[PDB]
Design a protein around this ligand. Structure first.
Ligand code: GTP
Ligand code: GTP
Ligand code: GTP
Ligand code: GTP
Ligand code: GTP
Ligand code: MG
Ligand code: MG
Ligand code: MG
Ligand code: MG
Ligand code: MG
Lengths: 293, 288, 284, 288, 288
């Protein structure tokens, strides 16, 4: 299987990120500090994945460093969550990150390192401007000096007030473990162009609502589709569909692949003024996706 | 202002019904016994209505009867909620119903009485069958002997597992307080027939999602629209729309009327013209 | 009957504050933008109080200013909520505050104005420090220029991450509407002298009386009382945890429907508590 | 590792039971039908245990039986949940239970079979009485004819309206996977007797609030401590202790054992000595 | 021989009903709780019948269910008596009834079940109204669910304040064991119409004063004769007769049938011929 480890200081936001990934946002208010490690198992495209949420209180971080084989071993990815709104605890956070990397070195493993600069809220980021960007740049410099190019590192700005920032970062991480064929993007890109200027955006999602494939004509089309899709997903699950809302038309479809348990979800967005997508075009597209993914 | 009173024994389901009406079903798992009377104010078509939820524990029921002018006076509608799954407490429920009716008599007021035979769940109703039907018929006989034709009494079977049963019963109650013109049903019927064989069902809702007008070509069209509308409303609120799914097409629209604060909601289901809709809405704005 | 009006821009936090007051914190994650005016009624010491939660989205603010008599009239207290983390919307917030004050002037009423500097979170205040205090000073100066000594104005810092900040501020507001006798504080002050802390709460868990020997005792009792309440309501009592001892009691007053709650924290006498309760029942 | 499997028909209540075990009762109102298998990992006295929640809708049960090695294999316990309020689906429930037992036989494994007669609510049980008792007796006969003494079977009446019904059954189930020494029951018994007539009830809980040991002088002392302890825990967790309410006094304590990660919880109820509690704790640390 | 079983909870009124049948109403005030089973033998139309009065206190009921073959075996009729004034013991009563039926199932016998809804006093029934009727209808449903159409069940409302209610129910019970020829009712009907409109009511009784045949022109004629007959019997016993009183005339006669030990009693009420009577007696002698 695969092991994904969430770690970081207490209050950094690890459990809230997980609650977003589980579509259980309503449980974020009732969140208490996580006690030791909480573990669950989920499936990504036919592969079972174990997820570890390490409670970040100091009494728990010490226990993690006392029995490192129990917690840090066999990790394929380490998600390290930093509360970028809490400058006063950043030095402490980098210090605990150095301890975690040191444990990986003693175990002689090199998991993918994914840093979530978390609580990067829209309101907070707008009011803080380049002052916040400079702080993140200093954080990366400290992280690079600790990593010393012995680990692969990725960085993402995340916030529970932007579901896409969490979904796409977690999807990008899973697709680094399970790389996709270049044919996938080439097929999606060619399908969009075969519609002749009548395709603003496409998403291919799995049963966890994680992103398997994507296309965006521009930044505005990306914002419209990624912000509307969760509500269309809620509608689909509660009830193929065609939805006209505002100046856009949405085509939604479910399809299965051989190796995965549950169906995948396809959504295509076009201008409302555009021609209706021919069903035979969507079906041939789905047939290729079933052979590529 | 109009006064609507929720009363009945504890555990009968009054607050859960209100939570359904407030679109807050998720809080039903968190419900505690209601402490005495809880009150809110909402608007229905430009009229304010105060809503009283009276906690049903015995210590509160005694307080209600000790100071009747503070709780039962000026009530325009009394909703009496009966847990029809609790046979063992029905005699106590009817007994307390007699007390409430007596206080109305002493105050010399005649509010509309609306019985909610509540917790009429689909699974429960299917397993209990004619026994539950006979048990409800016996409850009605006891209520009739208490009322003695001195009050207008309506009945409905309700359950939180059927949102339509609660929404349409409460809408029916409010439309008895505020009667509609006969032109409304005629306009909805005439608009439906003007679509040839291409109009299965219509719903006109207010901002509380209460039913102001309705049309159903048959029972199957009624089931499809009433079960699907709550999810379209959640989508519309979370974001004019058109939704095609299966063999049906759904048109949703919002329009305002002069006397009401928030817009109304129109949804039309057809098998799979903006002018017909715009002209329909214009007629509704002059009638509703 | 008294009318309390919650207003301010959308996203400022008004409904979350109300949810804390209703002991419904678990619903804050499920909150959506409030549509128009949501109204409820509750009792405070035998008095009925109507509470108005005005949705702050611009389309609703335009409707409030189009029909001022329907929303702002007969207001006894206006609670104006400002997201002090959102400097980018502060000019917009002060401008709408000016419009609200103007409607009060045209109605010729003078409600108590209670400003909540909301989202004053412990982490945010720790990191912003003195820069945030200067910002609050600028807001007070603007509000002063708008009020022009025609309204009584009070200020409070609030955050859903400090339940006491919201409970005490709202209690302080209600005690300005319904003033208490000075004998209440003196009776509590003298009972303790006869004690690290004392709270007298009503059935809404609002603060009717309080005593705190020092800042440390205050933090201990204020943070512990909700769970002592949760224990009580869900279930007199005597509790010992740590180096402290707690005494909880319930009693009724003549004009109130539900009982009041008394909790005393001492370092670790029935007759002295019963005489203290007797005096409270004759003063509150 | 150990594997616990929740299965049964859709709507039987499996996920609600798990929500109670996870101290997330507030989320029961938000539950949706479970899609295929949901899996979590928890610790019981130092042992990692995988928990499988198999969604019960028919399209999922067909998938389970198509690939029985992926779902039923290596199971230590099978919890089969039956909605005993839904007589109309009991024949369907027993038939799927027989299919599950058949898959265990083809795998040549013998998990403990634990039947939960769920939704045994206080109100429903009181109103149905002996009529429901006879129906449960008929269910046991069908289960026994399916088992044919090839499996170990346990039965429990459960309901989300009685938290102890679910906690104690799940605790009883875990203690059969990990049998305890007879010294634990004797030690708890002797300590309660060393207090003379000053010990009404004792509970020893783990960090999951599952029951490791228990003592009850009589049925009334059992109902007082079990219904009070969740609020004594929520107090302690959200915040040693002594509490006096009514005619009772309570002592709470936390202690750790060598092989477990988180502390255990001890609570003693007496009618209204620190050295005696410490020595009793020291004994438990060498026995558990 | 035939076996009739009187059973039911203590205080239900079993022994009081038997005292009415034995013409010993004066002993009702001296009744104590019956200790275990009391047994008598009486003759009905040439057939010996054993009558078991089972004491209903719980310690006796437990003794019955411990040795079911001694008490319940070979029963031809089980009379179950329910005090319908005591709602607080109806669950206990229905539960014990379920136990008795379970013993008949294990014995693989199917006696006639006769339910006496007892203490249906005129004053109590008048004051309780349809509330008592619903309760009896509820009890009837519980009995049906317990029986599952495996037994013949009859019902009657009985009370010691209406001798006819007890006499006619016990008579109807015995005639179900020993069905009569259809020529009997046709003969009584034909004799009545042969007297023109000069025949309001007829009773044919045995030496136990049980009703072998009856005829009533209307309800008033039934109430007059059924209420006057007990005193006519006492006069006849204490001493053929003719009695004129008010606007009615009563003819009484005694006759024997070949298979019965003691004479039968014929009473005819007419508005105010020996030969007609003698021939009517002759037909009855060969039909009964
Ligand atoms: N503004 C903002 N707040 C957030 C965000 N994410 C989480 N929070 C809040 O931050 C607090 C910390 O959340 P948690 O998820 O419990 O943090 P944690 O890392 O799991 O803490 P531990 O359980 O001790 O490990 C919670 O009150 C969240 O509501 C975010 O993206 N933006
Ligand atoms: N099966 C079923 N249960 C229901 C239904 N409605 C409410 N309940 C449950 O019945 C219980 C009673 O809920 P409440 O709404 O608090 O009852 P109440 O009348 O408000 O009781 P008081 O607050 O004491 O007056 C709750 O546990 C609900 O979940 C229903 O329609 N069907
Ligand atoms: N950090 C922080 N966030 C808060 C606080 N209070 C509320 N929020 C968040 O701010 C957002 C706005 O909350 P609301 O209470 O709905 O704001 P509102 O004033 O009611 O907005 P309208 O309904 O449009 O009038 C929500 O996401 C809350 O979670 C707080 O004290 N601190
Ligand atoms: N009255 C009563 N209702 C219950 C009880 N437990 C669960 N329910 C209700 O039963 C319904 C089914 O609950 P679930 O837990 O989702 O059932 P499930 O077995 O998980 O169904 P699937 O996800 O399809 O497998 C929900 O509406 C619950 O509220 C109970 O103990 N008593
Ligand atoms: N009002 C009223 N009381 C009755 C009636 N029949 C019996 N009772 C009273 O009910 C009480 C019970 O009478 P029993 O005949 O001794 O009852 P039982 O079933 O024989 O009791 P056990 O001997 O213990 O089995 C007596 O006090 C009677 O006076 C009736 O028809 N109406
Ligand atoms: Mg956490
Ligand atoms: Mg309630
Ligand atoms: Mg709001
Ligand atoms: Mg489920
Ligand atoms: Mg007797």
């Amino acid at each position: 299987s695969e092991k994904i480890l969430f770690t970081g200081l207490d209050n950094s936001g690890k459990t809230s990120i997980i609650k977003v990934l589980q579509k259980e946002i309503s449980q974020i208010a009732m969140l208490k500090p996580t006690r030791q490690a909480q573990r669950k198992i989920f499936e990504f495209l036919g592969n079972d994945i174990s997820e570890w949420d390490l409670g970040g209180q100091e009494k728990y971080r010490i226990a993690y460093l006392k029995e490192p084989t129990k917690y840090f071993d066999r990790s394929n990815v380490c998600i390290y969550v930093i509360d970028i709104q809490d400058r006063g605890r950043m030095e402490e956070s980098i210090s605990y990150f150095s301890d975690v990397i040191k444990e990986f070195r003693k175990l002689e493993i090199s998991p993918l390192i994914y840093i979530f600069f978390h609580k990067f809220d829209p309101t907070y980021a707008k009011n803080e401007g380049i002052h916040l960007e400079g702080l993140i740049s200093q954080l990366k410099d400290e992280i690079r000096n600790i990593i010393e190019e012995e680990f692969n590192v990725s960085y993402s700005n995340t916030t529970i007030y932007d579901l896409w920032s969490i979904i796409s970062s977690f999807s990008d991480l899973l697709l680094k473990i399970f790389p996709q064929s270049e044919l996938l993007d080439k097929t999606i890109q060619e399908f969009a162009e075969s519609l002749d200027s009548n395709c603003n955006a496409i998403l291919v999602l799995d049963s966890n609502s994680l992103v398997i494939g994507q296309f965006f004509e521009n930044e505005e089309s990306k914002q419209i589709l990624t912000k509307s899709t969760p509500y269309f997903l809620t509608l689909n699950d509660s009830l193929s569909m065609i939805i006209e809302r505002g100046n856009k038309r949405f085509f939604t479809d479910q399809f299965r692949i051989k190796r995965a348990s549950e169906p995948l979800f396809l959504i295509i967005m076009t201008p409302k003024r555009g021609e209706h997508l021919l069903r035979e075009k969507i079906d041939s597209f789905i047939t290729l996706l079933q052979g590529i993914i």
